[PDB]
Design a protein around this nucleic acid. Structure first.
Length: 224
RNA sequence: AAGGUAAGUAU
RNA sequence: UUGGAACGAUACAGAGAAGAUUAGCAUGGCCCCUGCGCAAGGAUGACAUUCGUGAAGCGUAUUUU
């Protein structure tokens, strides 16, 4: 795997690179490749470098100094913008499209909410599933909201904190594990007033145990 | 008797 | 013509002063600040116009002395 050079080692590497570039510039100036560097003049520096010529033509000297200052700013601004161009393409397509490397295992979290009659919470859950690229489904029934979400580990860790802490009748994760491949499609909604219609839909993808676990948890909560 | 030598080029 | 002297004589010069002098910028060190890139990571916001007939249900001859 990769190795991490220490802080002193980073300082040494940076110092050596800077000295190499400085020597490159110095030898270029020695051999006449580049013109010799001009003094860097700011407004407070104007009376020290251009002092004798700023009494004869003060405004020409001021204009020359400010042109040099702008050109120094022109290079820096252009450089930052030039590198910024990388994000232009490497942004929502290369700085926000990760997918958490979900290829060998899909973390699946099944939550059983008691009251999910608010459409705002379902819309926020659908937006969190579509933004984090986490597949799954949500089955509604009489005091039973079975929300299964299969995705990456980071998306599952985000959805475990969004549903239990960022969204408010209680929500409890009934099964948190991994699977071989994916079973559910995109994030859709389906209402089933009968338990058999939800169990037949959960058995179409081979996940009939999620409804039987949610029925058993409700039976164990209503028994005690 | 001293501690009081300018040095330097040029023949 | 040919010898003394040559540590001398004369000619020139004589500041026998005191010195690595001094201005500019950049680099380098340090602490911020600003912008961009790189590698990750936090927290959080967002939804889908008039009237009659025929039939059914309801109603406070005890409570406006």
């Amino acid at each position: 795997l990769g190795v991490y050079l220490t802080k002193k080692e980073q300082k040494k590497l940076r110092r050596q690179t800077r000295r190499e570039a400085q020597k490159e510039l110095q030898e270029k100036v020695r051999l006449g490749l580049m013109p010799p560097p001009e003094p860097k003049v700011r407004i407070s520096n104007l009376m020290r470098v251009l002092g004798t010529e700023a009494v004869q033509d003060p405004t020409k000297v001021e204009a020359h100094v400010r042109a040099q200052m702008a050109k120094r700013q022109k290079a820096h601004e252009e450089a930052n913008a030039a590198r910024k161009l990388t994000a232009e393409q490497r942004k929502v397509k290369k700085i926000k499209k990760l997918k958490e490397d979900i290829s060998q295992g899909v973390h699946i979290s099944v939550y059983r909410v008691r009251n999910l009659s608010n459409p705002a919470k379902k819309f926020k859950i659908e937006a969190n599933a579509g933004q984090l690229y986490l597949t799954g489904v949500v089955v509604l029934h009489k005091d039973v909201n079975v929300v299964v979400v299969e995705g990456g580990p980071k998306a599952q860790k985000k959805f475990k904190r969004l549903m239990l802490h960022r969204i408010k009748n209680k929500c409890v994760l009934v099964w948190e594990g991994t699977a071989k491949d994916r079973s559910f499609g995109e994030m859709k909604f389906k209402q089933c007033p009968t338990e058999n219609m939800a169990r037949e839909h959960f058995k179409k993808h081979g996940a009939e145990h999620y409804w039987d676990l949610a029925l058993s948890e409700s039976v164990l909560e209503s028994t005690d």
